[PDB]
């Protein structure tokens, strides 16, 4: 894949202040810091699922957020689960920086071994300064409590330990986090539970419920998140 490769370097030349010298120095450097390949977390059966989730999120963090502007693992959201799981395995083998969508697939791959853990995508549409912004994380449920795995440029727009007692509190935490960086939350897309079968021929349902956060209002927004939580226990 040489075409893509030189595409990434030309795009860096534009956006960075000293675009050209940066590519020269890095591509031409004979000695670079060797990056250790992150070890895939494997768990004893005695380890509680919350402690497992911290290790999965730590592994996801080690890969780092992809700031290069070029995505290394393209994801067709309509692919069957067994196709995305093959792709997650290759992220595991390539071990490259990632963005929001790739971390959701990794979170599913690494939590398929936890049948007591429910996983479901949560994507957000936010508004700021005339522009729209889309982000997505992996919602998780353990022992009746809610949390999230994901990848973001902000610390409070990804990992939440499974401590929220309702889905509303989890989502409103994200809305509050969006508000702290002056983003208005326009729309929330919540998916259905993801099968734990890594060979499953079914798609992820990214849009089982679409909530218009402005046209709904506070309490009607809360009732909709509670209906979605009720729906995942189907």
């Amino acid at each position: 894949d040489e075409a893509t490769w030189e595409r990434m370097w030309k795009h860096v030349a534009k956006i960075h202040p000293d675009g050209e010298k940066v590519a020269q120095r890095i591509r031409g450097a004979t000695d670079l810091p060797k990056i250790p390949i992150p070890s895939v977390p494997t768990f004893q059966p005695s380890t509680p699922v919350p402690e497992r989730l911290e290790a999965v999120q730590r592994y996801i963090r080690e890969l780092q957020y992809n700031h290069t502007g070029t995505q290394f693992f393209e994801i067709k959201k309509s692919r069957p689960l067994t196709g995305l799981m093959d792709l997650a395995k290759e992220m595991t083998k390539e071990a490259l920086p990632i963005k929001c969508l790739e971390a959701v697939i990794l979170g599913i791959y690494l939590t398929n071994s936890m049948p007591t853990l429910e996983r479901f995508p949560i994507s957000f549409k936010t508004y700021f300064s005339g522009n729209y912004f889309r982000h997505i994380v992996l919602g998780v449920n353990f022992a009746g409590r809610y949390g999230a795995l994901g990848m973001s440029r902000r610390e409070d727009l990804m990992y939440k330990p499974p401590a929220f007692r309702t889905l509303s509190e989890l989502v409103l935490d994200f809305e509050a986090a969006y508000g702290r960086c002056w983003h208005v939350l326009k729309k929330v897309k919540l998916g259905q539970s993801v099968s734990h079968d890594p060979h499953s021929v079914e798609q992820i349902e990214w849009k089982h419920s679409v909530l218009d956060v402005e046209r709904l209002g506070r309490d009607d927004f809360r009732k909709e998140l509670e209906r979605h939580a009720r729906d995942m226990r189907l």
Binding site: L32, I35, T68
Partner: peptide
Amino acid sequence: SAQQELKQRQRAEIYALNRVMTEL
């Protein structure tokens, strides 16, 4: 293995670039 020695150097370069791009 010519494929494999190429992915390791590319990975070192991607993370070198990724570090610079985190200046924001």
